[PDB]
Point group: D2
Chain length 86, copies 4
Protein backbone atom coordinates (compact mmCIF):
# COMPACT_ATOMS: atom_id res chain seq x y z
CA UNK A 1 0.00 0.00 0.00
CA UNK A 2 1.58 3.17 -1.36
CA UNK A 3 1.39 6.85 -0.60
CA UNK A 4 0.17 9.23 -3.28
CA UNK A 5 3.71 10.09 -4.40
CA UNK A 6 4.29 6.54 -5.61
CA UNK A 7 0.77 6.37 -7.05
CA UNK A 8 1.58 9.57 -8.96
CA UNK A 9 4.76 8.11 -10.49
CA UNK A 10 2.69 5.05 -11.47
CA UNK A 11 0.09 7.30 -13.13
CA UNK A 12 2.74 9.15 -15.14
CA UNK A 13 4.12 5.81 -16.38
CA UNK A 14 0.69 4.80 -17.66
CA UNK A 15 -0.54 2.54 -14.86
CA UNK A 16 -3.95 2.43 -13.13
CA UNK A 17 -4.29 3.12 -9.38
CA UNK A 18 -6.99 2.98 -6.73
CA UNK A 19 -7.39 3.41 -2.98
CA UNK A 20 -8.48 0.77 -0.47
CA UNK A 21 -10.33 3.47 1.48
CA UNK A 22 -12.61 4.51 -1.40
CA UNK A 23 -16.31 3.96 -0.67
CA UNK A 24 -17.11 2.79 -4.19
CA UNK A 25 -15.47 -0.47 -5.27
CA UNK A 26 -13.78 -1.46 -8.51
CA UNK A 27 -12.78 2.11 -9.45
CA UNK A 28 -9.41 3.23 -10.76
CA UNK A 29 -7.71 6.40 -11.96
CA UNK A 30 -5.38 6.81 -14.93
CA UNK A 31 -3.40 9.45 -16.84
CA UNK A 32 -4.40 10.91 -20.22
CA UNK A 33 -1.77 12.81 -22.27
CA UNK A 34 -2.30 16.27 -23.71
CA UNK A 35 -2.53 17.10 -27.38
CA UNK A 36 -3.60 19.40 -30.20
CA UNK A 37 -6.81 19.44 -32.25
CA UNK A 38 -8.00 21.66 -35.09
CA UNK A 39 -10.59 24.41 -34.69
CA UNK A 40 -13.45 23.33 -36.92
CA UNK A 41 -15.67 26.43 -37.05
CA UNK A 42 -14.75 30.09 -37.40
CA UNK A 43 -16.63 30.62 -34.13
CA UNK A 44 -14.22 28.20 -32.45
CA UNK A 45 -11.37 29.55 -34.59
CA UNK A 46 -12.00 33.05 -33.21
CA UNK A 47 -12.30 31.95 -29.57
CA UNK A 48 -9.32 29.56 -29.41
CA UNK A 49 -7.27 30.22 -32.55
CA UNK A 50 -6.78 27.87 -35.48
CA UNK A 51 -5.49 24.89 -33.46
CA UNK A 52 -5.98 24.20 -29.77
CA UNK A 53 -3.51 22.69 -27.31
CA UNK A 54 -5.04 20.80 -24.37
CA UNK A 55 -3.18 19.80 -21.22
CA UNK A 56 -2.86 16.25 -19.89
CA UNK A 57 -5.38 15.30 -17.22
CA UNK A 58 -6.49 12.44 -14.96
CA UNK A 59 -9.60 10.26 -15.35
CA UNK A 60 -11.58 7.94 -13.07
CA UNK A 61 -13.51 4.80 -14.03
CA UNK A 62 -16.51 5.25 -11.71
CA UNK A 63 -18.85 2.70 -10.10
CA UNK A 64 -21.31 3.51 -12.91
CA UNK A 65 -18.70 2.29 -15.43
CA UNK A 66 -18.37 5.68 -17.13
CA UNK A 67 -15.31 7.96 -17.20
CA UNK A 68 -15.11 11.15 -15.14
CA UNK A 69 -12.41 13.78 -15.12
CA UNK A 70 -10.78 13.37 -11.78
CA UNK A 71 -8.90 15.39 -9.17
CA UNK A 72 -7.76 13.62 -5.99
CA UNK A 73 -9.39 14.83 -2.79
CA UNK A 74 -7.25 15.95 0.14
CA UNK A 75 -7.97 12.60 1.79
CA UNK A 76 -6.78 10.90 -1.43
CA UNK A 77 -3.63 13.05 -1.45
CA UNK A 78 -2.79 12.27 2.17
CA UNK A 79 -3.71 8.56 2.15
CA UNK A 80 -1.27 5.67 2.24
CA UNK A 81 -3.59 2.91 0.96
CA UNK A 82 -2.95 3.28 -2.80
CA UNK A 83 -2.51 0.18 -4.96
CA UNK A 84 -1.56 -0.31 -8.60
CA UNK A 85 -4.37 -2.00 -10.53
CA UNK A 86 -3.76 -4.66 -13.20
Amino acid sequence: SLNFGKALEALKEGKKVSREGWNGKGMFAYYVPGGVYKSQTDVIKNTFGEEVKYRPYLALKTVDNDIATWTPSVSDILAEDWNIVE
Copy 2:
Protein backbone atom coordinates in the same frame (compact mmCIF):
# COMPACT_ATOMS: atom_id res chain seq x y z
CA UNK B 1 -21.70 40.86 -13.56
CA UNK B 2 -21.30 39.86 -9.88
CA UNK B 3 -23.11 36.52 -10.11
CA UNK B 4 -22.90 33.79 -7.52
CA UNK B 5 -21.77 30.33 -8.55
CA UNK B 6 -25.31 29.05 -8.91
CA UNK B 7 -25.90 31.57 -11.68
CA UNK B 8 -22.50 30.92 -13.22
CA UNK B 9 -23.31 27.20 -13.15
CA UNK B 10 -26.64 27.76 -14.95
CA UNK B 11 -24.68 29.72 -17.55
CA UNK B 12 -22.14 26.90 -17.91
CA UNK B 13 -24.88 24.31 -18.45
CA UNK B 14 -26.44 26.58 -21.12
CA UNK B 15 -23.14 26.62 -23.02
CA UNK B 16 -21.83 30.04 -21.99
CA UNK B 17 -18.32 31.06 -20.93
CA UNK B 18 -17.78 32.29 -17.38
CA UNK B 19 -14.98 33.80 -15.32
CA UNK B 20 -14.26 35.47 -11.99
CA UNK B 21 -12.95 38.98 -11.32
CA UNK B 22 -11.04 37.49 -8.36
CA UNK B 23 -8.99 35.03 -10.40
CA UNK B 24 -5.27 35.85 -10.42
CA UNK B 25 -4.74 34.98 -14.08
CA UNK B 26 -6.58 37.27 -16.49
CA UNK B 27 -8.39 36.60 -19.75
CA UNK B 28 -9.40 33.10 -18.64
CA UNK B 29 -12.81 31.49 -18.86
CA UNK B 30 -14.47 28.17 -18.04
CA UNK B 31 -16.98 26.25 -20.17
CA UNK B 32 -18.97 23.02 -20.23
CA UNK B 33 -18.22 19.99 -22.41
CA UNK B 34 -20.95 17.35 -22.92
CA UNK B 35 -20.45 13.68 -22.26
CA UNK B 36 -20.40 11.03 -24.93
CA UNK B 37 -19.36 7.58 -26.08
CA UNK B 38 -16.29 6.58 -28.10
CA UNK B 39 -15.29 3.14 -29.39
CA UNK B 40 -12.20 1.60 -27.80
CA UNK B 41 -9.09 2.34 -29.88
CA UNK B 42 -6.92 -0.73 -29.20
CA UNK B 43 -7.39 -4.28 -27.99
CA UNK B 44 -5.47 -3.33 -24.84
CA UNK B 45 -8.11 -0.66 -24.25
CA UNK B 46 -10.88 -3.17 -25.00
CA UNK B 47 -9.47 -5.49 -22.33
CA UNK B 48 -10.04 -2.79 -19.70
CA UNK B 49 -13.06 -0.87 -20.97
CA UNK B 50 -14.97 -3.23 -23.25
CA UNK B 51 -16.14 -2.26 -26.72
CA UNK B 52 -17.35 1.24 -25.82
CA UNK B 53 -16.38 3.91 -23.33
CA UNK B 54 -18.99 6.30 -21.93
CA UNK B 55 -17.52 9.55 -20.59
CA UNK B 56 -19.32 12.05 -18.40
CA UNK B 57 -19.70 15.76 -19.11
CA UNK B 58 -16.93 17.87 -17.64
CA UNK B 59 -15.71 21.44 -17.27
CA UNK B 60 -12.77 23.05 -19.09
CA UNK B 61 -10.66 26.16 -18.50
CA UNK B 62 -8.94 28.31 -21.13
CA UNK B 63 -5.81 29.18 -19.14
CA UNK B 64 -3.47 32.17 -19.27
CA UNK B 65 -1.20 29.99 -21.46
CA UNK B 66 -4.17 29.81 -23.91
CA UNK B 67 -4.24 26.01 -23.65
CA UNK B 68 -7.18 24.03 -22.26
CA UNK B 69 -7.15 22.39 -18.84
CA UNK B 70 -9.78 20.22 -17.25
CA UNK B 71 -11.23 22.24 -14.45
CA UNK B 72 -12.98 21.87 -11.12
CA UNK B 73 -13.99 24.97 -9.11
CA UNK B 74 -12.15 25.62 -5.89
CA UNK B 75 -14.12 26.22 -2.70
CA UNK B 76 -13.32 29.91 -3.05
CA UNK B 77 -14.65 29.74 -6.62
CA UNK B 78 -17.82 28.05 -5.37
CA UNK B 79 -18.41 30.63 -2.59
CA UNK B 80 -17.51 33.76 -4.63
CA UNK B 81 -19.99 36.34 -5.89
CA UNK B 82 -17.83 38.01 -8.56
CA UNK B 83 -18.66 35.71 -11.50
CA UNK B 84 -19.44 37.07 -14.95
CA UNK B 85 -20.54 35.77 -18.34
CA UNK B 86 -17.85 36.20 -21.00
CA UNK B 87 -18.63 36.95 -24.65
Copy 3:
Protein backbone atom coordinates in the same frame (compact mmCIF):
# COMPACT_ATOMS: atom_id res chain seq x y z
CA UNK C 1 -35.28 16.45 -3.02
CA UNK C 2 -33.60 16.39 -6.47
CA UNK C 3 -32.00 19.84 -6.26
CA UNK C 4 -29.25 21.06 -8.52
CA UNK C 5 -26.01 22.31 -7.00
CA UNK C 6 -27.09 25.94 -7.16
CA UNK C 7 -29.93 25.15 -4.78
CA UNK C 8 -27.73 22.96 -2.61
CA UNK C 9 -25.21 25.82 -2.49
CA UNK C 10 -27.89 28.30 -1.36
CA UNK C 11 -28.79 25.81 1.36
CA UNK C 12 -25.14 25.48 2.42
CA UNK C 13 -24.74 29.26 2.69
CA UNK C 14 -27.91 29.40 4.83
CA UNK C 15 -26.39 26.90 7.27
CA UNK C 16 -28.19 23.74 6.19
CA UNK C 17 -26.80 20.23 5.68
CA UNK C 18 -26.84 18.75 2.18
CA UNK C 19 -26.08 15.42 0.52
CA UNK C 20 -26.42 13.56 -2.77
CA UNK C 21 -28.35 10.37 -3.51
CA UNK C 22 -25.54 9.46 -5.94
CA UNK C 23 -22.76 9.47 -3.35
CA UNK C 24 -21.27 6.01 -2.76
CA UNK C 25 -20.92 6.43 1.01
CA UNK C 26 -24.24 6.76 2.84
CA UNK C 27 -25.32 8.89 5.78
CA UNK C 28 -22.90 11.69 4.82
CA UNK C 29 -23.62 15.39 4.58
CA UNK C 30 -21.77 18.61 3.78
CA UNK C 31 -22.05 21.95 5.60
CA UNK C 32 -20.62 25.47 5.59
CA UNK C 33 -18.16 26.86 8.13
CA UNK C 34 -17.71 30.66 8.39
CA UNK C 35 -14.37 32.38 8.16
CA UNK C 36 -12.70 34.15 11.02
CA UNK C 37 -9.54 35.47 12.65
CA UNK C 38 -7.33 33.80 15.25
CA UNK C 39 -4.24 35.15 17.00
CA UNK C 40 -0.96 33.46 16.13
CA UNK C 41 -0.12 30.72 18.65
CA UNK C 42 3.69 30.75 18.64
CA UNK C 43 6.48 33.12 17.69
CA UNK C 44 7.38 30.74 14.86
CA UNK C 45 3.83 31.21 13.58
CA UNK C 46 4.12 34.99 14.04
CA UNK C 47 7.25 35.00 11.89
CA UNK C 48 5.23 33.62 8.96
CA UNK C 49 1.73 35.00 9.51
CA UNK C 50 2.12 38.14 11.62
CA UNK C 51 0.07 38.81 14.72
CA UNK C 52 -3.27 37.62 13.31
CA UNK C 53 -4.41 35.03 10.80
CA UNK C 54 -7.57 35.56 8.76
CA UNK C 55 -9.09 32.34 7.42
CA UNK C 56 -11.74 32.10 4.72
CA UNK C 57 -15.04 30.26 5.02
CA UNK C 58 -14.88 26.66 3.88
CA UNK C 59 -16.97 23.53 3.41
CA UNK C 60 -16.89 20.39 5.57
CA UNK C 61 -18.05 16.80 5.09
CA UNK C 62 -19.25 14.39 7.77
CA UNK C 63 -17.79 11.18 6.30
CA UNK C 64 -18.86 7.55 6.57
CA UNK C 65 -16.21 7.23 9.31
CA UNK C 66 -18.20 9.93 11.21
CA UNK C 67 -15.15 12.22 11.28
CA UNK C 68 -15.02 15.62 9.57
CA UNK C 69 -13.08 16.26 6.38
CA UNK C 70 -12.58 19.51 4.54
CA UNK C 71 -14.54 19.23 1.37
CA UNK C 72 -14.66 20.54 -2.17
CA UNK C 73 -17.36 19.32 -4.60
CA UNK C 74 -16.26 17.18 -7.49
CA UNK C 75 -17.30 18.11 -11.01
CA UNK C 76 -19.86 15.31 -10.86
CA UNK C 77 -21.11 16.80 -7.58
CA UNK C 78 -21.36 20.22 -9.22
CA UNK C 79 -23.27 18.91 -12.28
CA UNK C 80 -25.61 16.52 -10.40
CA UNK C 81 -29.33 17.08 -9.83
CA UNK C 82 -29.89 14.60 -6.98
CA UNK C 83 -29.05 16.89 -4.05
CA UNK C 84 -31.19 17.02 -0.93
CA UNK C 85 -31.39 18.97 2.32
CA UNK C 86 -30.65 16.80 5.37
CA UNK C 87 -32.34 17.30 8.74
Copy 4:
Protein backbone atom coordinates in the same frame (compact mmCIF):
# COMPACT_ATOMS: atom_id res chain seq x y z
CA SER D 1 12.24 22.17 -8.82
CA LEU D 2 10.38 19.14 -7.50
CA ASN D 3 7.46 17.04 -8.60
CA PHE D 4 4.38 16.84 -6.40
CA GLY D 5 5.53 13.60 -4.76
CA LYS D 6 8.49 15.36 -3.16
CA ALA D 7 6.35 18.40 -2.35
CA LEU D 8 3.92 16.02 -0.61
CA GLU D 9 6.64 14.49 1.58
CA ALA D 10 7.73 18.04 2.44
CA LEU D 11 4.15 18.94 3.41
CA LYS D 12 3.83 15.89 5.68
CA GLU D 13 7.07 16.90 7.44
CA GLY D 14 5.68 20.34 8.17
CA LYS D 15 7.27 22.42 5.42
CA LYS D 16 5.72 25.06 3.13
CA VAL D 17 5.63 24.58 -0.66
CA SER D 18 4.66 26.58 -3.73
CA ARG D 19 4.75 26.32 -7.51
CA GLU D 20 6.67 28.53 -9.93
CA GLY D 21 3.80 28.23 -12.41
CA TRP D 22 1.15 29.69 -10.08
CA ASN D 23 -0.41 32.91 -11.40
CA GLY D 24 -0.56 34.56 -7.99
CA LYS D 25 2.80 35.28 -6.35
CA GLY D 26 3.99 34.81 -2.79
CA MET D 27 1.55 31.98 -2.01
CA PHE D 28 2.35 28.74 -0.22
CA ALA D 29 0.58 25.59 0.97
CA TYR D 30 1.07 23.75 4.25
CA TYR D 31 -0.24 20.78 6.23
CA VAL D 32 -2.57 21.01 9.24
CA PRO D 33 -2.94 17.97 11.55
CA GLY D 34 -6.27 16.47 12.56
CA GLY D 35 -7.71 16.48 16.04
CA VAL D 36 -10.66 16.22 18.41
CA TYR D 37 -12.90 18.95 19.85
CA LYS D 38 -15.87 18.84 22.22
CA SER D 39 -19.47 19.23 21.12
CA GLN D 40 -20.65 22.37 22.90
CA THR D 41 -24.42 22.30 22.36
CA ASP D 42 -26.88 19.43 22.54
CA VAL D 43 -27.81 20.32 18.95
CA ILE D 44 -24.19 19.68 17.95
CA LYS D 45 -24.02 16.79 20.43
CA ASN D 46 -26.93 15.09 18.65
CA THR D 47 -25.59 15.66 15.13
CA PHE D 48 -21.93 14.69 15.71
CA GLY D 49 -21.84 12.94 19.10
CA GLU D 50 -20.19 14.20 22.26
CA GLU D 51 -16.71 14.76 20.77
CA VAL D 52 -15.79 15.23 17.13
CA LYS D 53 -12.74 13.94 15.29
CA TYR D 54 -11.58 16.02 12.32
CA ARG D 55 -9.16 14.85 9.64
CA PRO D 56 -5.90 16.58 8.71
CA TYR D 57 -6.12 18.92 5.74
CA LEU D 58 -4.07 21.30 3.58
CA ALA D 59 -4.19 25.12 3.61
CA LEU D 60 -3.06 27.87 1.23
CA LYS D 61 -1.83 31.37 2.12
CA THR D 62 -3.51 33.29 -0.73
CA VAL D 63 -2.53 36.54 -2.49
CA ASP D 64 -5.09 38.27 -0.24
CA ASN D 65 -3.05 37.14 2.80
CA ASP D 66 -5.87 35.01 4.21
CA ILE D 67 -5.96 31.22 4.62
CA ALA D 68 -8.02 28.98 2.35
CA THR D 69 -8.57 25.25 2.57
CA TRP D 70 -6.71 23.89 -0.38
CA THR D 71 -6.80 20.96 -2.78
CA PRO D 72 -4.15 20.81 -5.55
CA SER D 73 -5.50 21.10 -9.07
CA VAL D 74 -4.64 18.47 -11.67
CA SER D 75 -2.09 20.89 -13.12
CA ASP D 76 -0.62 21.24 -9.60
CA ILE D 77 -0.53 17.45 -9.21
CA LEU D 78 1.22 16.91 -12.55
CA ALA D 79 3.65 19.85 -12.35
CA GLU D 80 7.38 19.62 -11.75
CA ASP D 81 8.03 23.22 -10.66
CA TRP D 82 7.44 22.83 -6.90
CA ASN D 83 9.78 24.51 -4.42
CA ILE D 84 10.07 24.37 -0.65
CA VAL D 85 9.47 27.79 0.91
CA GLU D 86 11.47 29.12 3.87
